[PDB]
Amino acid sequence: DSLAPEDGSHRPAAEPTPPGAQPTAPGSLKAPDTRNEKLNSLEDVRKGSENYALTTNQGVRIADDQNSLRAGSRGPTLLEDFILREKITHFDHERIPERIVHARGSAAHGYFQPYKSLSDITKADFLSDPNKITPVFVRFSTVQGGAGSADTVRDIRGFATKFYTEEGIFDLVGNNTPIFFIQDAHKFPDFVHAVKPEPHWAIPQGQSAHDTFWDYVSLQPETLHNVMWAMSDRGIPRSYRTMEGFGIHTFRLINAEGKATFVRFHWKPLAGKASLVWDEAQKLTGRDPDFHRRELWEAIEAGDFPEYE
Amino acid sequence: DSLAPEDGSHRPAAEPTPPGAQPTAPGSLKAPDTRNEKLNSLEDVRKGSENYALTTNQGVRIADDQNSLRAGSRGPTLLEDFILREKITHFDHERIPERIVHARGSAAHGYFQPYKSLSDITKADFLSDPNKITPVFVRFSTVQGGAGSADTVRDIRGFATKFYTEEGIFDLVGNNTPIFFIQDAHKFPDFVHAVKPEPHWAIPQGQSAHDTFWDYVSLQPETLHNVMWAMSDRGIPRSYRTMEGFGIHTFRLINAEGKATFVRFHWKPLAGKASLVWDEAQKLTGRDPDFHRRELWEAIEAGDFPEYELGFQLIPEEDEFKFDFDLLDPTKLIPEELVPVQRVGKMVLNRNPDNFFAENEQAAFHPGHIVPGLDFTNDPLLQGRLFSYTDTQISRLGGPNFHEIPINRPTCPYHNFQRDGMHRMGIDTNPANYEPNSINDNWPRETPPGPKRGGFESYQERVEGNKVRERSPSFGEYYSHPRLFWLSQTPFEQRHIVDGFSFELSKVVRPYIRERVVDQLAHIDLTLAQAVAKNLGIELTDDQLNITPPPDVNGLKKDPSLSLYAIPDGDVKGRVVAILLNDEVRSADLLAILKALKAKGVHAKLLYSRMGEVTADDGTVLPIAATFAGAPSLTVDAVIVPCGNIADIADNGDANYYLMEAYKHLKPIALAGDARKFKATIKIADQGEEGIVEADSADGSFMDELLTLMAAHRVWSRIPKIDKIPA
Amino acid sequence: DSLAPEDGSHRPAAEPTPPGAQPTAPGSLKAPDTRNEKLNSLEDVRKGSENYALTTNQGVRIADDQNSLRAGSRGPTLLEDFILREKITHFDHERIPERIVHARGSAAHGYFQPYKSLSDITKADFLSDPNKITPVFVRFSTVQGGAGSADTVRDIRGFATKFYTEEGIFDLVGNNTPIFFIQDAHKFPDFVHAVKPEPHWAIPQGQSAHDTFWDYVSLQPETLHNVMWAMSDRGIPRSYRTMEGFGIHTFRLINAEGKATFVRFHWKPLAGKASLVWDEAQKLTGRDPDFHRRELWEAIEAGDFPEYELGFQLIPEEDEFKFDFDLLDPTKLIPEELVPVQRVGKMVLNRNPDNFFAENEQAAFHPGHIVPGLDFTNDPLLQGRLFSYTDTQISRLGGPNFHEIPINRPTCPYHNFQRDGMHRMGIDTNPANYEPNSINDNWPRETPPGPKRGGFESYQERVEGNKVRERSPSFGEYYSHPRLFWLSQTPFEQRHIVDGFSFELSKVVRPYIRERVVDQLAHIDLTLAQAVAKNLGIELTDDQLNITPPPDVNGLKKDPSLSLYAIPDGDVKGRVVAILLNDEVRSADLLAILKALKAKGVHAKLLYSRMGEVTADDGTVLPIAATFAGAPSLTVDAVIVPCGNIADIADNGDANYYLMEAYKHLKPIALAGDARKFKATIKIADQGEEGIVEADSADGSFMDELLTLMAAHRVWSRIPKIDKIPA
Amino acid sequence: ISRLGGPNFHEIPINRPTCPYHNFQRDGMHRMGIDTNPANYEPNSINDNWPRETPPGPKRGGFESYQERVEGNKVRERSPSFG
Ligand code: HEM
Ligand code: HEM
Ligand code: HEM
Fold this sequence. Notes:
This is part of a larger assembly, with four copies of chain A. Chain A contains eight helices and ten strands. In chain A, a hairpin with a 2-residue loop joins β5 and β6 (168-175). The first copy, chain A, has a single domain (25-309), classed as Catalase HpII,  Chain A, domain 1, CATH 2.40.180. By secondary structure, chain A is of the alpha+beta class. A four-stranded antiparallel beta sheet of chain A has the order 3-4-5-6. Chains in contact: A-B, A-C, A-D, B-C, B-D, C-D.
């Protein structure tokens, strides 16, 4: 007599299945066959659970996890209850600081490969050979809202790719528009404070529709280009799968002879471009604020891998 | 040539003014005259800004705050730019850990005073004299959602009051329901994980409508009582001003002779009880997720101070066992029919903070911050809480010295031998850091316990039993309280409870969980389980249909104190009404509307298809506060549509839907003159209908009918008629 | 009946009193009258203790601070004991990270003033007016050892001064030598790891005498100059009062017209230069490892304020390239023969702190805290430092808000848009947190640069070159500075340097390292390498013997400013003398001894075989400050042994060895009457000897000879005679 | 929590147990372990209540405190027997 249903309908199929079909599940149980060198390198720190005893962090098996140790079935809790202290303590310290910006974000694993060697223009090992598969981790995000804000807000989106290359980690940290708000990083905090909730009362959440943000804009026309994009349907995407991604800055490529070529990076969505409309987007933040995080998760379980070029 | 407008319209009036009237502002600039000893003690750490030079944190004036220092107008940034490094660094480290729970929260300052000395029952100095004013800081909150989640979610609300007393800080850390989910603090993290977003993917935010939460519930029927409240309209309040607050645990009062009296604490809202309905609440999380935080802030700027009355249920020591549930079980309420709530004093929340991070975010409430005159009981959930609220500060607020953070600073003296935290502010001059010590003549000294100004000493409760990890058998009853709750509710309240469960349950993906929760409901009440099971498409079995209901609670068949709306105490002061404008408003209509509302403290917001102005028929200029879409019916208590150029708005999608939504959410609607032609959209008869006020023009009669509908909060009688409207 | 003694001898006098006279005490109780604007600004965070009740951090009075709350006088502790949990918790979290380097350090308050306005060369407000008094806080330190390591180690000393100016905090973060170990900050961690204890086993503490440090040296001859200083008596000072201090890098001064002048900063000790010798220093780390921290503390309580004179080497812009080393190379000194030090002002350190953790431990010095009037140069070690001192605070002092920690707080205004750290004290009222902002009329505002009270603006140095990671070729000279140093030293100073290297090198286990370091020494001076190589048992080869010495430095064959003792400026005020007592001291001897010493500000400590008292021959009662073993000769500058019952101590092992150790460490010794029979132990002749003052009795002549020996600090002429004595 | 920076100090290599350790504790600072359990709570049906409590026994049992009798009042007082 255990608590799982007899017919086994607690446990999802290890199979590509559509949104709604199955309960969702950790990648390593929903898609155990999907691999790559990063995901396999994580094996040493994964922990399973089936057929294991519940224990303290120090290894001790627990016999009753339903009660504090007290003097009598109706007495005080005793300070010698180290099982309770550890369990509460760990809970007590669960949280770590959210990101200053892009605190609200959704990720996945995957891989990249070049279409052709690029050694003409760069010695970047990860671009040296179209047979070279590079594991990636990607986190898409909003910018302004906290880690528990809505997904479909009118904001810029972040689009960050960590490439785990053979000659080091390369981070491509971009947005869903090809420009930024400001020209010099020295005014970074100024702008971010301007769009972040107002300091006296912490309002509004994941919105630019307030006094201070526009005050700033109106006094710094450098912002206007990106503000344009934000106000467009670009700032309310359908899906992380259906937006373009940009490195924004001009960088350099450097080849084996030392020749520099300027470059700007792009991600082009094989899913194409698609965005919501405002009333739909705004009301959807209420009806399902995890809309993007969800859609991404499901699309992946469903075999609809997001691809970008 | 400076950047402020010439006419001075950047700067808000230092005057009580309605929602929308002025830009909002830090309490110390919006209400500089409001004071109390806490707020004045904060003066040493406030910082102004006018007529000061912008500087580095080290005091250096900055000449250019628009640029990094680079080699050339187009070169690299140099590492010697300490101005840029400090400015970015500080920004880089701005954030601190959110609360584990109740991370999403809204606060204010204020005060409390007792109605009469309470020295008969407790030596608590703050309750000793009705002339003794105690400054308070209060933070209301949700439970599950992060610090950036929505306000109007279906969750429990927290209600925490820090009393800055003369013999120490007393923290009253309560919720908006009178029970908790669980019995022993050891399962705290289990339950909280169960309702918090799911670990694999971090979904859903500030919602209980997911698999794991209900899985837990279904396996731990101890939770069912509070789950009932959550599913009721209790779990989606109108305003922090319009909910009740509860200490939950039985505590002790202790007087100058050492007599213990058991007590449970209450906050009773002078604003009365009022709550939204689900569709309204859920969609409002999208339209304005800061709805509660906003409403609180504005109500305060507006002079509508939230007030609550502190009341005690008192139970003598020799009555411990007279009730047929255990006073120490926190999943059981003490019916007010058996123990009534005695009003003891009052709290007024009369000023907003200056900086939300400084004052709200960093405040630390902890229920074990009690004072002489109070003490704990063996409630095994309370017992737990004692441990956790001190611990968690060490990582949330960065160390043991969190009591030195301004808002948390006591306002009485505090001296000891505690030395050296991280971020230590106090500089101890005591030649000694230990006691006994002869080198400073043992100062500071222990203080023997006494009538007033004494040392703390715990009530000397007899403890007899063995060291066991076992739930008290007396806690083994799960259903009679839910049942009591449910039968106290009005019929429309019960529809809501039903629809509450049905909605949540419908987003549990694994259907066997839906069945198991239904099974639990069967043990509480069969009406209820039938209605829910219908909505999930489940047939109760013969077995389930025959399940014996649990006992009355101490012979009670209902308790009217458990209903929100049993005895309406709804109060209009502070509420807001939408006025739908057209380009040609009949001014004497409008005059009379605003004049009537103003007399009863009811705020209006004038709305239109666009911003700016429109002009009255008599050429009074009417400024627009927001558009129809900008400020949806969700955000208001009623809708009024005066006469004029109705043709202007008559075919406007947004104005029509404003009315349709308002109607579906059971709000009062008032239509003057040609505005009555809008009845067509709300599929109302020509005969009239209760809840729709109508007339040739707005007069004495028209306004009074409307305001009276408002004193009823909502038009419940409308419920049967709303399923046909498509909104 | 309280625990303080009836006669009040627990509580020290609020009066300047000598070392040993009184118990030591927090500055604000020992010297309440000493003030300055910093110390008075600290008043808001000081906490007293007398006549206050002992309480929890939340304000609650405690009645019993001797017990946990338990179920029964013999039962378990209960989790509801919040008094115990808070008290233990705070203790549990007392410690914060030690400094990465200079973790071991000692501080005090004080002030500075300029001798004359300096507005000709700099607009630095703090140097604008000789009437302008600037409060300072100074922390002296070692480098390698942990916060609980010894004071008298052979290490570099740090010397950090925080100036609390009217236009911001200026941090002067220097050392006790005029150069550094390395050229580019990129190798900072490499060197520091090399000298810090070895990673496998954490050995040795505050010592450079290990394998890895010398391995590094031997492979990076850039280090050799400063290593020279370290090995000299410079690396084992007598007192923080008796060393020179250096800013090391060339900085810029910038005046009201924008003219840059290069500058290097100096502190010149009004106490003069004085240092221990190795055996004395090393053994003193065992006998009193707090020797420096103590001496500083006492000197201050005693009225012997440490004073230093701030001096500048100034070099005009067009002289950048006149020197045959690079002004930007921090491993090169600017000889005072080529650029003399101009005294500019003076600093007085006139009050100890109240709480060592509060004020010392938490203080944050950072060289990039400069003000208008000052600016940086491209010194590639300095360039580095700029980055690190802001960064490291984030984990040492727990966040970006470390400038809010009391001691670190500026004393001028500071306002900006920086919001929200961990442990945020300031509560910002600015309606705006950004600029430009119109909503607060852009306050606080940028300030254009100007003659005084202006914005900071960097000197607009021309930068021309490509982005490279390459050491300047002009830095490629390693030996001529060491050579200069060495040839400036007196012969006995050079023995010490030799013995320095020989000792350290002898504890390098892998002998090939010993050889490689010797090889380096060969390139500096062959005398030196011969002496060291002898002591390690190494034969220099023919190759090594022929190595050409490096060039003179700009035609210099020596610089007397680089010697400690070239031109003795040793000063007796503040020094201490041991007086060896017997049970029958001849009182008129002693009268004359203490009377003479007192006239020149020289402190005495009366010592005996045990504690308590002894009586004079005339029945004056002589209190004993410590025993012979309790306060070894190490801790004193000279030893005096008056007449009386010499028989009492004549055969006492400890009294004899007191003298033998004192003699081996070249200290002045003075023996009256029968005390002359002690000459026997120190293997002195009957004829006399220079450095041993002797006579029938202590008179005008006897005392003066002694004090004059003291003005010479040590008896160098004794050196040849000490190897025969076995101490 | 402050010396070693968080609740996850048992994950620091030297401190790591050498036997199995599994529970529902989630998320410290510097979390090394990546939990795959579909559930982070118990009772839980969705992972068939794993990992499970273990009743106490001769070897390999759950921990259970010795059931010492406690009798006295809640006092802050040194035992006289210690005097
Ligand atoms: C060029 C325009 C920018 C783009 C495309 C951009 C992109 C982002 C993205 C996508 C994230 C979220 C990273 C994640 O998922 O972990 C992010 C986080 C961050 N960004 Fe921005 N960013 C931009 C400008 C800036 C500027 C000007 C600063 C500061 C000067 C800044 C500092 C940060 C910091 C400190 C974090 C997150 C904390 C962390 O991940 O360690 N970024 N950046
Ligand atoms: C009796 C039922 C409970 C009530 C009425 C309750 C009330 C609350 C409220 C209102 C907050 C938000 C405080 C704020 O605004 O700062 C809160 C936070 C917290 N609670 Fe609960 N709580 C309950 C159960 C528990 C249990 C069982 C634990 C742990 C065993 C717990 C531990 C915490 C911690 C660690 C925090 C916040 C972190 C902090 O403020 O230091 N509480 N409690
Ligand atoms: C120019 C040669 C140097 C001098 C004269 C020097 C001086 C000092 C002194 C005296 C201290 C102790 C400060 C105190 O009492 O709080 C110190 C600490 C420190 N130094 Fe060095 N230093 C030098 C080189 C460096 C370099 C190259 C770095 C890194 C590149 C460095 C980074 C630090 C840090 C991070 C601290 C202490 C942590 C803190 O106070 O915030 N310094 N410096």
